């Protein structure tokens, strides 16, 4: 899935 | 719990060691133990709590998406069973974080920096629950929206537009609008207004604060690029 | 154990799903459950067992090294306590793998491909125990050497020099010599002879087998480059 | 620590 930018660690 | 016998300072020290070792499940357990000491958290400690759980839930979300995609393509019981196993574990982590915020981090948070930080986390963990919800989905979405909205109201009254916490909140709330609330226009409007108001306030910042704010502004820009 | 009620085929299917989801602790637990069914493992199943535990122990080894380095530099009790916690968990995983090999994977393994595969794993997990040993260190080193030596003897008699399992065994035994046994000359000699004998046998292979063998030969070359 | 090449997943 195309994940959009969210705050903090890009852990997924 | 299992961290009840360890000193609060030793739990914080061990959370920092666990972060260095990339041991995020341990880091989260140490920070949960520190929160359960009952004292309020400093800015650094709030960030250790959030980094720990974000890394743990991040691994679970990435695994859940891989399994959900295999399940969707397949449509024996194994893929569904295993997707359910990961989903339950993810729900458990969200419930644990929400429990810490409700018992009693939010109610004791009076300063804007702490209250907005916790209400944003409440919004984020209800958003992660919404990503897997199919049943209660509407109520979970409402709970995420309510937490984000309270955090936004406080942030607009009490923090400057370049405030890193305010920026991160707006970034996350815009993503909630885009793909949870099916409100892409609200998402785009929020990301644009937040970016533009921060740009106009950059002149007030030091070199270090400018770096902090522009890093998050670039994330708003990245999303806007994909959405427009 | 906890996997006792699940079908062997469902445990293998779920181990493959866990690998796709990068859920290596789950992958290892599913493969442990499959081994405990008591039946011998196929080539694919042996590789699923090894990939699962290698990923789990790999994370623990990387964390242990970060903590040990902080501890060494520092020389309160927290760094030692946390390094000990990770060390105990790592020892537990090695003991679990060694227990599966001893009960009863090795004793039932008659073919060279399975017997060498298991004896190499026995050598590897005693080597991971040796990396953290300071007490029993000599006996752990002896156990690793003995397992690797039995695997080498069988591999030289029963497999061609380009056999991927034989190559991987030689690669690992040469690393055991270099940094566990403090025998860098034995390490270099073994890596050189193994590389040269494999090179001379490449002409017998198909395009796919050639790719498999040369990939491991490059690892022997990488080590030789660092050692000479 | 400088880790040498070993077989399989480079998981550490
Ligand atoms: S309150 C100052 C501060 C800000 C951030 Cl973003 C932060 C992250 C930390 C971490 N260890 N991951 S600590 C810390 C402190
Ligand atoms: S026995 C044929 C075979 C060889 C290798 Cl290296 C292998 C790795 C697998 C994995 N799923 N990681 S399965 C498999 C089979
Ligand atoms: Mg207060
Ligand atoms: Mg047999």
XYZ file of C-alpha atoms and ligand atoms in Angstrom:
512
model
C 0.000 0.000 0.000
C 1.150 3.588 -0.756
C 1.823 5.091 2.718
C 1.801 8.889 3.084
C 4.264 10.808 5.269
C 3.430 10.849 9.005
C 5.449 12.261 11.937
C 8.380 10.386 13.514
C 10.012 7.019 12.822
C 9.098 5.623 9.351
C 8.990 2.153 11.064
C 6.443 0.488 8.739
C 3.840 -4.741 36.397
C 7.136 -6.513 35.540
C 8.979 -3.133 35.787
C 7.475 -2.317 39.196
C 10.721 -3.094 41.067
C 13.025 -1.017 38.836
C 13.910 2.617 39.602
C 12.297 5.206 37.322
C 15.771 6.613 36.409
C 17.079 3.095 35.572
C 14.027 2.473 33.309
C 14.756 5.755 31.374
C 18.463 4.881 31.135
C 17.569 1.385 29.830
C 15.037 2.802 27.354
C 17.913 4.942 25.872
C 20.204 1.883 25.738
C 17.418 -0.175 24.053
C 16.978 2.570 21.429
C 20.758 2.453 20.679
C 20.515 -1.380 20.359
C 17.367 -1.088 18.114
C 15.456 -3.147 20.734
C 12.158 -1.287 20.441
C 9.940 -3.844 22.239
C 12.290 -3.577 25.262
C 12.359 0.239 24.857
C 8.527 0.330 24.954
C 8.362 -1.958 28.003
C 10.889 0.228 29.877
C 8.942 3.413 28.980
C 5.602 1.793 30.001
C 7.267 0.968 33.366
C 8.446 4.612 33.682
C 4.956 5.983 32.928
C 3.466 3.605 35.540
C 5.646 5.247 38.225
C 2.899 7.898 38.191
C 5.078 10.968 37.695
C 4.622 13.317 34.740
C 7.111 12.866 31.783
C 9.690 15.412 30.641
C 9.936 16.388 26.956
C 12.758 13.863 26.354
C 10.842 11.102 28.172
C 7.660 11.766 26.105
C 9.723 11.446 22.954
C 11.281 8.161 24.216
C 7.782 6.790 24.890
C 6.528 7.823 21.416
C 9.626 6.589 19.485
C 9.410 3.194 21.279
C 5.769 2.507 20.529
C 5.958 3.995 17.011
C 8.682 1.501 16.105
C 6.787 -1.436 17.647
C 3.424 -0.560 15.987
C 5.265 0.265 12.718
C 6.547 -3.296 12.403
C 3.056 -4.652 13.142
C 1.380 -2.303 10.576
C 3.906 -3.290 7.847
C 3.331 -7.016 8.613
C -0.482 -6.571 8.715
C -0.424 -4.875 5.280
C 1.654 -7.705 3.710
C -0.772 -10.312 5.167
C -3.938 -8.354 4.257
C -2.676 -8.049 0.632
C -2.050 -11.850 0.440
C -5.490 -12.475 1.996
C -7.251 -10.099 -0.480
C -5.518 -11.860 -3.457
C -6.455 -15.341 -2.038
C -10.130 -14.156 -2.012
C -7.498 -22.842 3.731
C -7.986 -20.654 6.829
C -4.265 -20.023 7.468
C -3.781 -16.604 5.822
C -6.873 -15.198 7.620
C -5.797 -16.852 10.918
C -2.279 -15.385 10.732
C -3.524 -11.929 9.600
C -5.919 -12.071 12.614
C -3.007 -13.027 14.946
C -0.939 -10.013 13.836
C -4.047 -7.766 13.900
C -4.847 -8.780 17.513
C -1.238 -8.110 18.585
C -1.364 -4.667 16.875
C -4.713 -3.878 18.618
C -3.135 -4.917 21.897
C -0.227 -2.443 21.460
C -2.657 0.388 20.527
C -4.838 -0.423 23.536
C -1.758 -0.411 25.824
C -0.665 3.042 24.553
C -4.219 4.427 24.787
C -4.421 3.005 28.341
C -1.240 4.864 29.367
C -2.594 8.110 27.901
C -5.934 7.637 29.744
C -4.262 6.452 32.996
C -3.165 9.230 33.591
C -0.899 11.087 31.184
C -3.499 13.299 29.508
C -5.416 14.289 32.621
C -2.154 15.433 34.329
C -0.885 17.303 31.212
C -1.486 21.033 31.653
C 1.191 22.605 29.473
C 0.481 22.924 25.792
C 3.677 21.020 24.797
C 2.695 17.966 26.844
C -1.111 18.082 26.307
C -0.848 18.490 22.502
C 1.856 15.748 22.387
C -0.406 13.254 24.202
C -3.608 14.142 22.380
C -1.758 13.729 19.039
C -0.582 10.231 20.237
C -4.236 9.442 21.177
C -5.290 10.438 17.632
C -2.443 8.355 16.092
C -3.181 5.137 18.001
C -6.955 5.365 17.277
C -5.903 5.960 13.609
C -3.813 2.703 13.688
C -6.848 0.909 15.153
C -8.993 2.431 12.334
C -6.568 1.107 9.655
C -7.550 -2.524 10.655
C -11.179 -1.870 11.748
C -14.092 -3.399 9.727
C -16.688 -4.141 12.461
C -16.886 -0.137 15.633
C -14.882 1.390 12.670
C -17.051 4.567 12.755
C -16.644 4.990 16.523
C -12.836 4.401 16.290
C -12.634 7.055 13.514
C -14.683 9.487 15.657
C -12.318 8.898 18.648
C -9.253 9.630 16.434
C -10.905 12.796 15.019
C -11.926 14.042 18.489
C -8.387 13.649 19.898
C -6.753 15.313 16.887
C -9.304 18.173 16.992
C -8.723 18.904 20.707
C -4.924 18.838 20.035
C -5.378 21.196 17.023
C -7.500 23.660 19.030
C -4.879 23.887 21.813
C -1.977 24.060 19.342
C -3.529 26.975 17.381
C -4.133 28.939 20.606
C -0.887 28.140 22.467
C 1.916 27.442 20.002
C 3.519 29.295 17.095
C 2.791 27.913 13.578
C 6.365 26.577 13.278
C 6.111 24.572 16.543
C 7.453 21.054 15.649
C 4.701 19.369 17.725
C 2.002 21.553 16.088
C 3.485 20.741 12.617
C 3.629 16.972 13.275
C 0.063 17.033 14.572
C -1.180 18.843 11.452
C 0.760 16.431 9.209
C -0.842 13.397 10.935
C -4.345 14.900 11.063
C -4.108 15.671 7.306
C -3.204 11.973 6.662
C -6.153 10.909 8.888
C -8.414 13.111 6.689
C -6.968 11.762 3.445
C -7.151 8.063 3.941
C -9.183 7.305 7.090
C -11.988 9.930 6.900
C -12.076 9.813 3.028
C -11.805 13.646 3.097
C -8.949 14.332 0.592
C -9.981 17.974 0.181
C -9.829 18.590 3.973
C -6.411 16.860 3.990
C -5.044 19.043 1.190
C -6.477 22.272 2.734
C -5.010 21.470 6.151
C -1.559 20.572 4.748
C -1.474 23.741 2.559
C -2.609 26.163 5.323
C -0.196 24.580 7.848
C 2.740 24.816 5.377
C 1.951 28.439 4.406
C 1.506 29.645 8.047
C 4.752 27.942 9.065
C 6.648 29.508 6.088
C 5.523 32.968 7.221
C 6.895 32.388 10.765
C 10.323 30.904 9.812
C 11.928 34.369 10.026
C 11.518 34.276 13.871
C 13.609 31.128 14.340
C 17.195 30.312 15.161
C 19.255 28.113 12.788
C 18.496 24.916 14.862
C 14.714 25.620 15.227
C 14.571 26.457 11.483
C 16.085 22.986 10.718
C 13.486 21.268 13.043
C 10.459 23.103 11.497
C 11.562 22.843 7.823
C 12.111 19.048 8.214
C 8.375 18.611 9.030
C 7.280 21.188 6.457
C 9.029 18.996 3.806
C 6.820 16.078 4.894
C 3.673 18.253 4.340
C 5.136 19.171 0.876
C 5.827 15.467 0.094
C 2.188 14.601 0.805
C 0.879 17.614 -1.151
C 2.994 16.497 -4.144
C 1.370 13.026 -4.067
C -2.141 14.471 -3.528
C -2.218 17.258 -6.186
C 3.988 -26.678 23.128
C 1.801 -23.718 22.033
C 1.878 -25.044 18.410
C 0.852 -28.568 19.450
C -2.729 -28.149 18.167
C -1.806 -26.772 14.725
C -1.382 -29.005 11.657
C 2.205 -29.482 10.467
C 1.246 -28.197 6.958
C -0.439 -25.082 8.457
C 2.713 -24.353 10.545
C 4.903 -24.511 7.347
C 2.415 -22.333 5.443
C 2.415 -19.793 8.320
C 6.222 -19.846 8.554
C 6.314 -18.809 4.817
C 3.737 -16.055 5.454
C 5.750 -14.826 8.499
C 8.906 -14.664 6.347
C 7.025 -12.514 3.758
C 5.824 -10.228 6.618
C 9.397 -10.065 8.116
C 7.976 -11.571 11.352
C 10.972 -13.755 12.178
C 10.090 -14.515 15.829
C 6.717 -15.877 14.606
C 8.506 -17.704 11.744
C 10.846 -19.391 14.268
C 7.966 -20.363 16.574
C 6.040 -21.906 13.646
C 9.147 -23.849 12.502
C 9.863 -25.037 16.093
C 6.238 -26.310 16.175
C 6.786 -28.106 12.823
C 10.010 -29.762 14.045
C 8.205 -30.911 17.226
C 5.726 -32.872 15.067
C 8.530 -35.462 15.000
C 8.771 -35.942 11.241
C 11.997 -35.326 9.326
C 12.261 -31.930 7.445
C 12.473 -31.487 3.676
C 15.194 -29.288 2.144
C 12.823 -26.281 1.955
C 11.658 -26.818 5.554
C 15.284 -27.006 6.840
C 15.994 -23.718 5.116
C 12.841 -22.140 6.658
C 13.990 -23.284 10.114
C 17.521 -21.881 9.587
C 16.398 -18.533 8.045
C 13.939 -18.000 10.953
C 16.412 -18.563 13.757
C 19.267 -16.795 11.926
C 17.171 -13.628 11.724
C 16.107 -13.857 15.386
C 19.658 -14.532 16.715
C 21.052 -11.895 14.296
C 19.016 -9.141 15.937
C 20.124 -10.336 19.389
C 23.842 -10.498 18.363
C 23.710 -6.949 16.884
C 22.029 -5.639 20.085
C 24.499 -7.521 22.345
C 27.463 -5.983 20.466
C 26.076 -2.414 20.821
C 25.531 -2.986 24.587
C 28.899 -4.727 25.141
C 30.678 -1.778 23.419
C 28.866 0.754 25.696
C 29.693 -1.418 28.736
C 33.415 -1.695 27.764
C 33.623 2.143 27.329
C 31.827 2.699 30.715
C 34.565 0.511 32.336
C 25.531 2.346 37.848
C 24.647 -1.310 37.163
C 22.176 -0.604 34.326
C 24.380 -1.146 31.248
C 25.658 -4.493 32.638
C 22.102 -5.493 33.700
C 20.653 -4.747 30.250
C 23.594 -6.386 28.398
C 22.993 -9.451 30.652
C 19.236 -9.400 29.805
C 19.936 -9.452 26.050
C 22.732 -12.032 26.534
C 20.386 -14.386 28.452
C 17.710 -14.057 25.741
C 20.343 -14.817 23.042
C 21.564 -17.882 25.039
C 17.963 -19.009 25.318
C 17.470 -18.899 21.509
C 20.756 -20.814 20.937
C 19.752 -23.411 23.528
C 16.316 -23.804 21.865
C 17.906 -24.386 18.419
C 20.512 -26.786 19.854
C 17.669 -28.623 21.653
C 15.774 -29.105 18.366
C 18.922 -30.431 16.677
C 19.555 -32.855 19.593
C 15.854 -33.842 19.910
C 15.911 -35.384 17.284
C 16.886 -33.773 13.993
C 20.523 -34.876 13.846
C 20.022 -38.452 14.984
C 17.327 -38.991 12.280
C 19.400 -37.284 9.521
C 21.000 -39.945 7.324
C 21.451 -38.168 4.003
C 24.492 -35.993 3.585
C 22.406 -32.900 2.628
C 20.391 -33.055 5.852
C 23.152 -34.289 8.228
C 25.710 -31.677 7.070
C 22.996 -28.946 7.204
C 22.156 -29.773 10.844
C 25.721 -30.272 12.026
C 26.652 -26.882 10.478
C 23.691 -25.294 12.418
C 24.996 -27.020 15.609
C 28.435 -25.463 14.960
C 26.858 -22.021 14.267
C 24.717 -21.884 17.420
C 27.629 -23.035 19.659
C 29.685 -20.303 17.863
C 27.009 -17.674 18.814
C 27.167 -18.958 22.406
C 31.009 -18.664 22.244
C 30.768 -15.003 21.083
C 29.219 -14.081 24.532
C 30.995 -16.718 26.697
C 33.528 -15.596 29.386
C 32.993 -18.204 32.157
C 32.623 -22.817 29.985
C 33.997 -20.728 27.007
C 36.580 -23.462 26.196
C 33.972 -26.242 26.299
C 31.533 -24.187 24.123
C 34.357 -23.602 21.578
C 35.178 -27.348 21.594
C 31.468 -28.199 20.970
C 31.359 -25.768 17.985
C 34.625 -27.207 16.564
C 33.434 -30.819 16.981
C 30.140 -30.164 15.142
C 31.832 -28.268 12.304
C 34.507 -30.995 11.981
C 31.953 -33.839 11.736
C 30.028 -31.766 9.112
C 33.296 -31.113 7.178
C 34.267 -34.809 7.194
C 30.870 -35.865 5.774
C 30.807 -33.001 3.254
C 34.274 -33.866 1.848
C 33.285 -37.536 1.424
C 29.702 -37.096 0.155
C 29.340 -33.787 -1.671
C 31.058 -32.084 -4.604
C 33.305 -29.077 -3.757
C 30.751 -26.649 -5.251
C 27.896 -27.972 -3.050
C 26.230 -24.801 -1.584
C 25.847 -26.470 1.850
C 29.508 -27.625 1.797
C 30.590 -24.068 0.757
C 28.519 -22.362 3.488
C 29.878 -24.786 6.073
C 33.480 -24.070 5.044
C 32.801 -20.309 5.069
C 31.392 -20.497 8.637
C 34.086 -22.866 9.932
C 36.778 -20.503 8.540
C 35.140 -17.590 10.475
C 35.033 -19.797 13.621
C 38.807 -20.379 13.160
C 39.540 -16.698 12.572
C 37.808 -15.048 15.444
C 36.639 -17.716 17.921
C 39.574 -20.203 17.884
C 42.180 -17.390 17.327
C 43.534 -19.485 14.404
C 43.731 -16.903 11.540
C 46.133 -19.078 9.541
C 43.745 -22.088 9.682
C 40.913 -19.730 8.633
C 42.841 -18.387 5.640
C 44.010 -21.899 4.561
C 40.480 -23.303 4.770
C 38.922 -20.380 2.844
C 41.636 -20.554 0.115
C 41.471 -24.368 -0.365
C 37.637 -24.305 -0.391
C 37.578 -21.462 -2.979
C 40.198 -23.125 -5.228
C 38.521 -26.602 -5.139
C 35.136 -25.049 -5.910
C 36.603 -23.014 -8.846
C 37.952 -26.235 -10.373
C 34.487 -27.895 -10.237
C 32.401 -24.974 -11.644
C 32.682 -26.421 -15.174
C 30.315 -29.300 -14.137
C 27.421 -27.011 -13.194
C 24.320 -25.677 -14.868
C 23.741 -21.892 -15.099
C 21.511 -21.894 -11.918
C 23.891 -24.099 -9.817
C 26.835 -21.938 -11.000
C 24.994 -18.816 -9.660
C 24.338 -20.583 -6.260
C 27.997 -21.741 -5.826
C 29.676 -18.504 -7.043
C 27.523 -16.426 -4.613
C 29.106 -18.293 -1.644
C 32.563 -18.341 -3.226
C 32.366 -14.488 -3.302
C 31.808 -14.532 0.474
C 35.015 -16.643 0.924
C 36.812 -14.073 -1.344
C 35.396 -11.144 0.712
C 36.814 -12.656 3.907
C 40.168 -13.480 2.267
C 40.414 -9.836 1.109
C 39.947 -8.602 4.709
C 42.346 -11.238 6.125
C 45.318 -10.927 3.693
C 32.739 -4.757 15.724
C 34.002 -5.763 12.237
C 31.867 -8.830 11.332
C 33.188 -11.238 8.684
C 30.982 -12.881 6.046
C 29.006 -15.930 7.251
C 26.367 -18.007 5.410
C 22.729 -16.887 5.074
C 20.809 -13.829 6.273
C 23.135 -10.922 7.263
C 20.633 -10.245 10.139
C 23.088 -8.679 12.626
S 12.309 17.748 24.311
C 13.857 17.718 23.375
C 13.852 16.423 22.614
C 13.253 16.342 21.361
C 13.246 15.148 20.664
Cl 12.487 15.118 19.108
C 13.807 13.974 21.188
C 13.929 12.637 20.675
C 14.548 11.774 21.515
C 14.853 10.370 21.276
N 15.714 9.812 22.126
N 14.427 9.644 20.319
S 15.012 12.557 23.009
C 14.387 14.083 22.466
C 14.401 15.277 23.177
S 16.060 -27.182 -0.904
C 15.720 -25.860 -2.091
C 15.704 -24.586 -1.295
C 16.883 -23.885 -1.061
C 16.867 -22.716 -0.324
Cl 18.369 -21.890 -0.074
C 15.689 -22.202 0.237
C 15.412 -21.031 1.024
C 14.112 -20.897 1.380
C 13.511 -19.810 2.141
N 12.179 -19.755 2.117
N 14.119 -18.888 2.777
S 13.141 -22.221 0.776
C 14.517 -22.945 0.001
C 14.519 -24.122 -0.738
Mg 0.578 18.700 35.288
Mg 16.329 -40.401 8.271
